[PDB]
Amino acid sequence: APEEERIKYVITVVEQIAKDAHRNGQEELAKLAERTAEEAKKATERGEEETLRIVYVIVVVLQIALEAHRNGQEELAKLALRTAEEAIKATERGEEETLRIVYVIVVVLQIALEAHRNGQEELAKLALRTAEEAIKATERGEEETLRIVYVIVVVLQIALEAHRNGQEELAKLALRTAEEAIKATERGEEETLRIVYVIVVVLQIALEAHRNGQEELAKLALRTAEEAIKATERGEEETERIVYDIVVVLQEALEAHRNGEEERAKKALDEARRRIEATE
C-alpha cells in the first residue's frame, strides 16, 4: 500500500530524530520531534475517517438521484446528479490538495533530517516546528472538512425525508443548499491550492540552499513558509466562525421540519443558502 508506506516512512524519520535528540541531550529538539510525530499520526487517522465520510456522502447523493428517478420526480434527480458531480470534483481537488500538502511535510522533514545530521541543530528545530504547524494546519482543515461534511449530510437527510413525504419544494431547496456548500468548498480548495503551491516553491528553495551551503538563505526561506502557514491558519479561523453560524441554522431547519412547520424549515434552509454563497 503506497498510501501506507509513505506515512510510515514519515513517522519513522521523525521518531528517529527524537531518539537521536535524546542521546545527544537536545530535549527541545526531542520534545518537538515527539509531538510532531504524534500530530502526523492524528492527521493520518483523521484523514482516513475523512475519506470514508466523503465516500458515504457521494453514495447518498447518488442514492437520492436513483430513488428520485424511480419515484417520478425528475427535476430532483437531475439536481442530485448535478450535486453529485460537483461533490466528485470537490473530492478530486481535495486529493490533489492532500498530495501537495504531503509533499510539503516531506520536504520540511527532509530539511530537518539533513540539518540534524549535518549539525545545524538550530535549523533542525526550525524545520520541525514548521513541520508541526503544517500538520496542525492540516488537522484544522480536516476537522473543518468534517464540519462541512456534516452540513451536507444533515441537508441530504432533509431532502430525502421531504422527498418521501411528497415535499419536493423542501427537497429541491435542500439539495440546492447542499449544492452551494460543495461549490463553496471547491472555491476554498482553489484558493488553498494556490497557497500550498506557493509554499512548495519556498520550501524547495530552502532544501536546495541547505544542500549548496546557503544556510542564511535556507533559514529565511524556511522562516517565510512558517509565517505563510501561520497566516493561512488565522484566515481559516474566521471561516470556522461562519460555518458554526450555518450549523445553528441547519438545526433550526431540522427542528422546524420534524415538528411539521415546513414553512419555517424552508426559510431556514434559504437563509443558510445565502450565507454559504457569501463565504467564498
Residue numbers in the entry: 0 to 279
Mind quoting what the paper says about this structure?
Here, inspired by natural and re-engineered protein–peptide systems, we set out to design proteins made out of repeating units that bind peptides with repeating sequences, with a one-to-one correspondence between the repeat units of the protein and those of the peptide. We use geometric hashing to identify protein backbones and peptide-docking arrangements that are compatible with bidentate hydrogen bonds between the side chains of the protein and the peptide backbone. We design repeat proteins to bind to six different tripeptide-repeat sequences in polyproline II conformations. The proteins are hyperstable and bind to four to six tandem repeats of their tripeptide targets with nanomolar to picomolar affinities in vitro and in living cells.
Crystal structures reveal repeating interactions between protein and peptide interactions as designed, including ladders of hydrogen bonds from protein side chains to peptide backbones.
